[PDB]
Amino acid sequence: SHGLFKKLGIPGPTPLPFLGNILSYHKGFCMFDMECHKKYGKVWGFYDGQQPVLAITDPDMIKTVLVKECYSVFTNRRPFGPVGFMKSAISIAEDEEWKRLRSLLSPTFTSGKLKEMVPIIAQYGDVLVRNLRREAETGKPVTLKDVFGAYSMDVITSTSFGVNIDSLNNPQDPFVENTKKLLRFDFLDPFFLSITVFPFLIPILEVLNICVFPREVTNFLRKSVKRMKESRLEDVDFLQLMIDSQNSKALSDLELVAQSIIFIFAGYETTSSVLSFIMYELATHPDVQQKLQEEIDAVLPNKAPPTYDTVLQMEYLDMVVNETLRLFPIAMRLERVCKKDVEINGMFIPKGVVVMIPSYALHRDPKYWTEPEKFLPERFSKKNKDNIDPYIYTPFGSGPRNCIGMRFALMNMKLALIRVLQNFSFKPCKETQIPLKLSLGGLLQPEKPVVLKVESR
Amino acid sequence: SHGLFKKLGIPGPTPLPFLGNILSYHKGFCMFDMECHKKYGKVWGFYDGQQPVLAITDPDMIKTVLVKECYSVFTNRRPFGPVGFMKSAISIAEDEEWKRLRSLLSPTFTSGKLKEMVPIIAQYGDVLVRNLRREAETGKPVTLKDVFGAYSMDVITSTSFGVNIDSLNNPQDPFVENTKKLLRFDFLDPFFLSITVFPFLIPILEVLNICVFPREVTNFLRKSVKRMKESRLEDVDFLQLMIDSQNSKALSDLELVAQSIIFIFAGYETTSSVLSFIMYELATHPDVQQKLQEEIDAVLPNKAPPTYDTVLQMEYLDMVVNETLRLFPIAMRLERVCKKDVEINGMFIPKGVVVMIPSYALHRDPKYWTEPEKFLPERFSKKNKDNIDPYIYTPFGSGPRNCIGMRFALMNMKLALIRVLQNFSFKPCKETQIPLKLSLGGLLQPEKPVVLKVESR
Amino acid sequence: SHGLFKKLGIPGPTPLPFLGNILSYHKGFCMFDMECHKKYGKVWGFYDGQQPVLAITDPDMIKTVLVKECYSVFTNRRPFGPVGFMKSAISIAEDEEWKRLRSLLSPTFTSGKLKEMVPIIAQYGDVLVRNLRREAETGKPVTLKDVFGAYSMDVITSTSFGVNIDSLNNPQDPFVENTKKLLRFDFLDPFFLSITVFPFLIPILEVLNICVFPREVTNFLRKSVKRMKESRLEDVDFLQLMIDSQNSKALSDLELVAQSIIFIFAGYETTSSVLSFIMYELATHPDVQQKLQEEIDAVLPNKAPPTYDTVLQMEYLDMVVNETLRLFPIAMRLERVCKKDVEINGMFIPKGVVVMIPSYALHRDPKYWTEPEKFLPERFSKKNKDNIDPYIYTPFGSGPRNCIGMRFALMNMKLALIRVLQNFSFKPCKETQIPLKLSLGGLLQPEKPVVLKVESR
Amino acid sequence: SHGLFKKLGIPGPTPLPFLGNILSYHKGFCMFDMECHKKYGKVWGFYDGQQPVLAITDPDMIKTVLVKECYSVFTNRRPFGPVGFMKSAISIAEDEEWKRLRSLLSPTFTSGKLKEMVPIIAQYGDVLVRNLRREAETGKPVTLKDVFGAYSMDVITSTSFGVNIDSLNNPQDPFVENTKKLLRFDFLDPFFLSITVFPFLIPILEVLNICVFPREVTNFLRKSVKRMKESRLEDVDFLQLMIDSQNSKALSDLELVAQSIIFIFAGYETTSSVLSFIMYELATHPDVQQKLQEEIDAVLPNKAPPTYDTVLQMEYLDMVVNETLRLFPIAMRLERVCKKDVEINGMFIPKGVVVMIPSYALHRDPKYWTEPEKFLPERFSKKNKDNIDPYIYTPFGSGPRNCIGMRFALMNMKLALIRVLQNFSFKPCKETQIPLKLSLGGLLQPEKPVVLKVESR
Ligand code: HEM
Ligand code: HEM
Ligand code: HEM
Ligand code: HEM
Ligand SMILES: CC(C)(C)OC(=O)NCCSC[C@H](NC1CCCC1)C(=O)NCc1cccnc1
């Protein structure tokens, strides 16, 4: 099985027996990917165990994979481990169950439904401020991922189930506890590496009701939901929206529980981690932070409360957000299984091959980005934003399987940043890691957690 | 997983934990199936481990499965174990590789190509006679499966590769040895039962290059073929026909080796075992045997050599053959995986369910057959043959995945039977098992091997 | 493998393929064991999967197993699953690592060291009272396992590491949280039953650093200990005692962490569950409760604080405790692997066979106990205590591998019961389950949790 | 687990994750071992998967392992795969079953019993001659392993069961066929390498009655023996000797079948392969061959038939044999599992570590052997034989677990060589591989099979 790329005249690094090239993940996906791109060119291959994975960096080729032949050929992502009933979550589901599921949950994420969610996310914007000011009034360096974790959790709890907790001060609410265990997967920790070497063991685990989702969190929420379900039934949030949907092919109950869980998992560490990357960049580029605080005050004078419309109004805000995702695209890669022997843009792809787009590397490619490591929001000026290829810059992926939660993720984050910058300024501490070193692990996240000083305006 | 049939209001026997109903295979597939049909009605379910298997006996419903929605829904059979490169044999291949493969091998089985193969199969008809007469001249009771095994092997060797061995007298020819190990699979022996309980182990075995096809036989033939291939290339048989085919999507070389192997496996014990069932029936119904010997002598007077055309000429011959397959349909069941949630003839079939047609039981069903256990060829008289439902009587299955080798199997067998009955008469011995008890195992085959007395006409 | 007992002329129930007799655990170990004893006699066998397990109820035979040939033949218990570094905990360790470990931890459990621990366990006796009175003053039915759980945890935290938490009011102390997850193992839950059917999977799990001890609790305590270790080093409890021991074959650090963990696991739900069984019995036998409260007040007048010496002073106290363990011997069984072909008291035991003593059943055997189901403490009167066979009554097992923590467990429990009965009386509620039904699961524990009314004296 | 040798300050090559150093077996055990010895010194370690294996080359240390603490510590060899009932063969059995089994089979291999076997092995010496002369009279280059295979098989068949076949001319005798499949194990073929990486899969295989001994050969012999057993019972060979032994702790029947099988496996390819190595050396050192033919003719004039006593009479014969085993010690390594934490000759060996003696390398060590690659029988002259350390030269191992079949193996081989050299001379062909390259695989055997010219004296 290790001769496939050698036969198709595709270049790449040499796979050791059983391991493939996984030993080369010792500097993380990102670094490996950047190195590979440099050595091998526009396309290359490698092996995750016996799994062949082919990399591609041609925007046209990418578009065909992610848009054109999405339905016919490149419809699903790669399996990664045992999942139990979470087999039915949309980000995991495959082919027709997916298309079906994608349909039942899309109206939930309209610009319409989203404009309705704005006042709630706004209320926890406030709760954030109060908590921050408590630390700002006690001149003690702040850990963002905490305060932001607390926030991002606060907004999920309230927008998916309408449970309204100040998780930062109520860390020990059972509803807060279980949900905090739903953290992004380290695909380079002991366990998943083994799965990569012995995927033949995945079935043995499924048959043991072992799941990568801790059996206790899921069981907590399954019943939590079936309570909420039958407390609102009968007597505005994602659950409501999903309960309304199965009031017609219609969403099953366990299906409904599954999605709910994934929304938490999806929004939680991601909204948290991204907000952290942005405060780091703002504090190490004080000019940008000033330019922002002034735009914010112009649209929203007297520290006016942001709205759905005043948010899309702000352009330097969108630029700062976008540039950050360029430097830190927390998905790192996009991936699709090739379900048929196909030929796309002149290249034969055999079946079962996993096709991969190395986002991190591309967002940091000198051939598309002047001074790529530098933090320069002006790349996204309405003057230069046009020059940017949508299939090189893909922080939310692209095509029928792009991030369903993108509009929501972007607003969530911006509503926070405004209210925060309306009130404080963020200054580097001595214990602040400048320049931020990235984790050599399997998540896009800082080597050392970001600590900053905060001051009241 | 064991609640599926209970939910769909389908009846059946209660599955024990992990085993399902496999413990009920202690009297073999056939008996279990007959019992089930009687208890539970027109449709029922059971579990091979965790695998749900639904039985169906409505001819309409059957037709939809085997013909109508063959391509869309019910395209493949159930996996059964580790297969290695034999993954590419047609009877094993799935979906598009299958349709493709089915296409490249069909012209090989035309009435045209078959009429060309007749003189070769005829030559080993002769070799059979000589061997039989040696035993007939030495009044020693004969074991058919041997003499017939020897024959059926002789015809394969010669029709697939043109190697011409008298295997009965050359039992120790390397080409004869390897090929005799390709015997039908006992799906109720220790090994396959475990596979049924731990299908999650199948992948562990594949990854150990362990295959249910002994790694030595296959390796013998792979190279045997790549010799023949390059001895004829360059300087009438199935190999020729397949080599000509890849002289164009065209048949690969290892693909070609795979099919060759399956043709042997397919034709060998089957042509042998069926010919045995027929001699048993003939000898325990001496009237039928006389009626046959007289028809044979009328079409072919002076013991004239049968031809392609004189063979299709013989009608009592076809009746005797057909009735035998009714009583002994060596496939026992037909099976299809349900690849989508579907509804056929008013019944909801969830995905992944294996759908099954219990041939043996149906061929022995009193509601379609008067005195079913009795051996009465007149059921297939051109007068009554019309009254027989093609979707109740299915010894070669039906629809796009029916037995590719049916015409060939039927002629093979008839060419033998004529030449044999032209010369001898077969009389029961005292050591003959009357009435023939069927094996309680996982193959349709006699409990005790068939021994008969043979006399020269 | 399933023919072993059939060959040795030992009776028992018939094992199904792969499962053995595990299907007969549907009414729990206890019931199965009681039934078996009745049907089959003094000795019998059955199969946990392919594992042969032989039961024995002859006190002599038992003594040989648990005492005489302990070292030579019956030294270890049966493996049960993947354990990681907890392979080194004493209750799990085998043979020479065990004997060694047993030696390094025994001085920790002297009558000497124990008399020193009495004032600390006394302080949380007090904390218990206050908490109870809060519920007693608010006439709301009380759940014992909670209040007692809280207590039993309080005493462990303080006696193993000197951390002093009121866990009932501090439920959300990180030290309290992790440790509450160390609960007795349900050997009849989905997971362990599978392990019993596929013990061949245990090694696959070990090789995945999966452990039946949640990898987070253990990792919390490993470092927690290595802090305490290096905070006391340098600047009375089990840790001290173990740190002093490795200040010499001497206790390693990870070895030390392992034992610490097992002491928690051991003492926690056990001290809790037993105290619960006793309050149930006391409240459904009000006479006994009065007789006790009067003995307590005689030794300790003016609600005097109990001491080590006033505790061993109390005889009706010991009787009540003992009788409870008769009815509820929370270990249920004792077990030893037979490491050699041996013959003990006239019976040939082949190697690898697990030998078992069915405590629950024996403690409830009419041939040794008049009215066994009845609760009658007088069985243990210094007059009748003599008539009781130590190898029929074994709540703490017996011999070199008996419960290392017995003296400590007994004092712990009695110190609680005195202080509690000194202050309140416990009366059945309407929601109280009379008579207590036992869990049909794999732990000795009540079907419904015990709720009682509590009143201030 | 990969840090063990690093901790004990033992040197060696760096293990990759999961594989250990197995990738370094690409030039075979022998080469790896020679390289290691050179780099790392007198002792070193490496990992076969996760299995630590420590090498040792100090003769004293070796003696302690193989003799002194054999019983107490280093009693068994390493498991290698699934074995089924062959678990009971002596070379596989462990600890007390071994000691027992070793005792019941030792009297079978006395100098006494051996002197009785000499005339039978002599008769097939003759059959060899006739076959050789047929090739010698038809000047066609000869393949030794064949003719010798044929011989070595002939002598086993006759000495273990008294079945008397000329296997070279009867290649197709069922008794000859099955037994020829019992060939030495390639511990570097796909299968065993996987076992080395996933030893956790060995139990899954055992539970599938899969055995590294083909289930058909063993089943053939099991019944073959139980026939012979009951044909001689009732109405001189190893079977007789074992049947007599169980006529007394006494040999069971399946136990008996197991040993019989191992004797075949043991003697077959080994006697064959060694005889081949010797003819190669003789023909590439024509001087030695002449010196031998003259000694042979002196003890046995007029081509007199060798006897037990005339065989031990011949000293250049013993020298030639011995030197060959120096250059080609077909066991390659000796191995013992360390069953306890021990310290031997100043070195701490933790438990479970496999201890290894690299025979091949040591026999070719310049520090003990002048011109080691050269073939010089005079090393074993009764003058220099004294200077040779028995714990450096170990072709049959040493100590309580040395080759049980050594006396027999040596006589077998010498009886052949005499009768052969009495009649022919062996001259290199052009197609002869000079100098013989060794297989880079996992058996000591020539890269290309040895072909020589043979001439009649
Ligand atoms: C900063 C925040 C986020 C970023 C940068 C991000 C990025 C991504 C990316 C790159 C993908 C894969 C797209 C592809 O495969 O082409 C994805 C998938 C997905 N995201 Fe997000 N995402 C974010 C937040 C969220 C949030 C808040 C939700 C809330 C539900 C969400 C729900 C999903 C779902 C359901 C998928 C898989 C869609 C499918 O398979 O049909 N994401 N995201
Ligand atoms: C007495 C002889 C035979 C009988 C009674 C018989 C019967 C059957 C039956 C019932 C099936 C399954 C049909 C279905 O799934 O609906 C089958 C499949 C098949 N048979 Fe035969 N068969 C015979 C001989 C042969 C021979 C001689 C060949 C020679 C190549 C052959 C080749 C095949 C193949 C390739 C399949 C699977 C077809 C596919 O999956 O595309 N069979 N046979
Ligand atoms: C009500 C409380 C308890 C009861 C009824 C109880 C009973 C038992 C029983 C029956 C055994 C098995 C004995 C055998 O195999 O023969 C045992 C083992 C053991 N118990 Fe307890 N036990 C209790 C509490 C404790 C406590 C508080 C500790 C504190 C450390 C403890 C530590 C242990 C250990 C370490 C073993 C295994 C000993 C060894 O394998 O060397 N137990 N217990
Ligand atoms: C040229 C022929 C042979 C050579 C060079 C040879 C060499 C060896 C070696 C080096 C060992 C391992 C010794 C150790 O572990 O220290 C061994 C083991 C063994 N050999 Fe041989 N051997 C030969 C032939 C035979 C024959 C003909 C038999 C006939 C039965 C035999 C039976 C055994 C047995 C049973 C063992 C394992 C002994 C035990 O584990 O108790 N060997 N041999
Ligand atoms: C439906 C089931 C599972 C209950 O039973 C059967 O499969 N019966 C056997 C006949 S269909 C398929 C059969 N296996 C081939 C695919 C797997 C390996 C070879 C076969 O076709 N083998 C060659 C063959 C056999 C008999 C008739 N024709 C061809």
Side-chain angles (χ1 to χ4, degrees), chain C residues 36-103:
Chain C
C36 263
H37 188 14
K38 172 181 155 52
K39 280 174 214 154
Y40 296 110
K42 63 173 184 290
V43 304
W44 68 94
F46 57 93
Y47 301 81
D48 289 339
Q50 298 275 345
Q51 172 62 226
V53 184
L54 160 89
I56 64 172
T57 69
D58 180 71
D60 286 328
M61 202 166 287
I62 305 201
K63 173 185 177 161
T64 305
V65 170
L66 302 184
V67 180
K68 304 184 175 193
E69 311 270 331
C70 172
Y71 298 112
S72 57
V73 186
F74 299 101
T75 312
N76 319 306
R77 301 195 181 85
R78 97 161 104 202
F80 55 99
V83 288
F85 81 95
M86 285 292 301
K87 66 188 188 306
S88 302
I90 172 187
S91 51
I92 300 158
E94 300 178 350
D95 292 315
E96 289 316 314
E97 280 56 36
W98 163 75
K99 210 126 51 177
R100 196 184 132 265
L101 278 181
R102 184 84 191 199
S103 303

Side-chain angles (χ1 to χ4, degrees), chain C residues 151-169:
Chain C
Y151 166 77
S152 169
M153 160 72 49
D154 280 18
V155 181
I156 291 171
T157 48
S158 50
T159 43
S160 39
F161 312 116
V163 163
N164 298 281
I165 312 177
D166 183 0
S167 64
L168 187 67
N169 285 307

Side-chain angles (χ1 to χ4, degrees), chain A residues 74-99:
Chain A
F74 299 101
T75 312
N76 319 306
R77 301 195 181 85
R78 97 161 104 202
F80 55 99
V83 288
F85 81 95
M86 285 292 301
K87 66 188 188 306
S88 302
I90 172 187
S91 51
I92 300 158
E94 300 178 350
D95 292 315
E96 289 316 314
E97 280 56 36
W98 163 75
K99 210 126 51 177

